[PDB]
Amino acid sequence: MILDKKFHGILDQGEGVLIIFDEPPVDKTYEAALETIQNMSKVVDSLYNKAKKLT
């Protein structure tokens, strides 16, 4: 049920330790990375216009 991610935890066999933690700021790297990937086609399509117009 950690593998189905119903809650926060991770187990141990040598030590038997449970650790509970979370990551709240999920929406930063999403919008950042998607802004990079959407700007990829801007720069590459720009290079298609310029590679068109020069050579």
């Binding site: 930063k28 950042a32 802004e35 990079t36 700007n39 801007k42 720069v43 720009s46 216009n49 310029k50 117009k53 020069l54």
Partner: protein, 286 residues
């Protein structure tokens, strides 16, 4: 009782009138004007005022000259034209609180209600706020000293209602508005250390003078809370705040990728038009 006051710039412009209607005599004392305002709400709101011929003596501080008939006539005609504002308090334009000001204050503590005092400046060379609201209250002291009228600062803001903004903004054409971005942020970020610098340096030097050369209860007790709160920042070790600098530095990295990426998007129309306009106007020029 009262947390804050609101003073409109009209009355301070009438203190410009206080320095206009002098007539060059050589006196230029702390000319008292009869402050009017709204004590009605818990906040105090100054709308307008007028002034009264006030004279002290050269040597004696405790000789002071006011008028009840001028107060009741100017306030009477003013209440006849506008009864939505009443008497509230007063002000002297001198930089210094005299000993007499408890007695000068006491006349408007009697006939008006609990009156507010405002210290302002004859020459507006102070970078700080010229207006300080001093509540006229008697407070019981822990040392056992007998109770006297004590002027505690009530915090103040200077706001204009509607048309005072328009007229002032039309008269200036020199000030710039809010204008967030580089300039109005970065100018506060230029002079801001000078603004706490002249405050602190203006205070602790003559304060330090009153340390060794001072007596007569300077509120010696508030030095303990003063220095106490000053020693509530004992040069933090930053060890927990390291990760806070990872946080603001990672937000900084977000501003890096936004600045780099978005400016690089602005490069598009530039690095298209630079070729396609020039070479086509060139090749159809001939």
């Amino acid at each position: 009782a009262v947390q804050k006051v609101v003073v409109h710039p009209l009355v301070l412009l009438s203190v410009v009138d206080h320095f206009n209607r002098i007539g060059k005599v050589g006196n230029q004392k702390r000319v008292v004007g009869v402050l009017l305002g709204s004590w009605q709400k818990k906040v105090l709101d100054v709308s307008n005022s007028f002034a009264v011929p006030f004279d002290e003596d050269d040597k004696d501080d405790s000789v002071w000259f006011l008028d009840h008939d001028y107060l009741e006539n100017m306030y009477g005609m003013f209440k006849k034209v506008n009864a939505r504002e009443r008497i509230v308090g007063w002000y002297h334009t001198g930089p210094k609180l005299h000993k007499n000001d408890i007695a000068i204050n006491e006349l408007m503590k009697r006939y008006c209600p609990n009156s507010v005092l405002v210290i302002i400046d004859v020459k507006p060379k102070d970078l700080g706020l010229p207006t300080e609201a001093y509540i006229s209250v008697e407070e019981v002291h822990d040392d056992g000293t007998p109770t006297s009228k004590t002027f505690e600062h009530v915090t103040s803001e200077i706001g204009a209602e509607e048309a005072e903004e328009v007229g002032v903004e039309h008269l200036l054409r020199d000030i710039k508005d809010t204008t967030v971005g580089t300039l109005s942020q970065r100018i506060t970020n230029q002079v801001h250390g000078l603004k706490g610098l002249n405050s602190k340096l203006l205070d602790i030097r003559s304060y330090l003078e009153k340390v060794a050369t001072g007596k007569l209860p300077i509120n010696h007790q508030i030095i303990y809370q003063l220095q106490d709160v000053f020693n509530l920042l004992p040069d933090v070790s930053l060890q927990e705040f390291v990760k806070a600098f990872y946080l603001k530095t990672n937000d900084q990295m977000v501003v890096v990728y936004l600045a780099s990426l978005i400016r690089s998007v602005v490069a598009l129309h530039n690095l298209i038009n630079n070729k396609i306009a020039n070479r086509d106007a060139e090749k159809k020029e001939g």
